[PDB]
Amino acid sequence: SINQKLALVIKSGKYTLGYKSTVKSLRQGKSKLIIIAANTPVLRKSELEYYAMLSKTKVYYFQGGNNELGTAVGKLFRVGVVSILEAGDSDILTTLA
């Protein structure tokens, strides 16, 4: 599945949860992929899309709201956007997802 790869990244790789951390990592160019939930507001989503276009960072649209994405990460709080700095022991970057 796709949630297994995210959980593997959380356990072994490097990641940032939240809009501010993702934007900071995009500004530093330390991001490899950004996962965006379907619940995110349109203005913040468009700003993230423009930032990814500027920084040439891959974008994946999570099929679920922020709390489904949080549960996939393994957290009991809603997360709207995730940035994958390093895949680690997972293979989410290789599979284009």
Binding site: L33, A52, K56, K58, V59, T95, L96, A97
Partner: peptide, 12 residues
């Protein structure tokens, strides 16, 4: 060089 930024699964 970039031609696409939106990602998707490969094996489906």
């Amino acid at each position: 060089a970039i031609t696409n930024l939106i990602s998707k699964l490969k094996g489906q």
